[PDB]
Amino acid sequence: GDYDYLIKLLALGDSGVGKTTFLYRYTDNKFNPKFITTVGIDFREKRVVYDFKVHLQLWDTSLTTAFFRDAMGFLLMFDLTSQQSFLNVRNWMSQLQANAYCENPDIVLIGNKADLPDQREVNERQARELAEKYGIPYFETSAATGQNVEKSVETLLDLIMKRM
């Protein structure tokens, strides 16, 4: 423990895609909360109610902002075996840009579950184009195998190190 930079990367994408497994494979056992408190503003009032006097609280229908907080690079991720998750990239990208530190931060496009060719619904060309539309690297990965799992974070880190 004698380094020089501490930098934050965010993985974002639909449930299933392999974020949890991807990181887990890229890292190895780190079940450790970083933590703070969180607000829950709620109104209150002191009603009287004969059948007593009741005080009562009034709640209503967050952390998201706290996740994109400081995130200097993004792993935009989908499931190669799911045409649906590929389409949702359009939408994770939207709320990414809305929350990030900058309008175009550093994203690497990750197609995961590359080890399931039999179950594929997303083609190389498709992704490559979206990637280029946005103008960012693309990586076909597997959390199961390790395919490109490192190269993808590394291409990300390498990018977030362009300064001035």
Ligand X SMILES: Nc1nc2c(ncn2[C@@H]2O[C@H](COP(=O)(O)OP(=O)(O)O)[C@@H](O)[C@H]2O)c(=O)[nH]1
Annotated binding site for GTP: 13-21, 60-61, 112-115, 142-144
Candidate segments 37-45, 55-63, 110-118, 126-134, binder of ligand X by CB under 6 A: 110-118
CB 88, CB 57: distance < 8 Å: no
CA–CA gap between residue 108 and residue 115 (Å, rounded) = 19
Binding mask 128-157 for ligand X (x = CB under 6 A): --------------xxx-------------
Q: Rounded to 5 degrees, what are φ and ψ at 128? A: -45, -40
Single residue of 18, 73, 105, 111 touching ligand X by CB under 6 A = 18
Tell me whether residue 28 or residue 103 sits nearer to ligand X (CB atom).
28
Candidate segments 9-17, 63-71, 102-110, 150-158, binder of ligand X by CB under 6 A: 9-17
Long-range contact pairs involving 126-134 (C-beta distance under 8 Å, separation at least 24)? 126/86, 127/86, 130/86, 130/89, 134/93, 134/107, 134/109
Q: Which amino acid is at 116?
A: L
Single residue of 9, 16, 120, 137 touching ligand X by CB under 6 A = 16
| Antiparallel, parallel or unpaired: β 43-48 and 106-112 | unpaired
Single residue of 15, 32, 37, 65 touching ligand X by CB under 6 A = 15
Tell me whether residue 19 or residue 107 sits nearer to ligand X (CB atom).
19
Provide the 10 A C-beta neighbour count for residue 136.
20
Using CB under 6 A, list all residues that contact ligand X. Answer: 15-21, 112-113, 115-116, 142-144
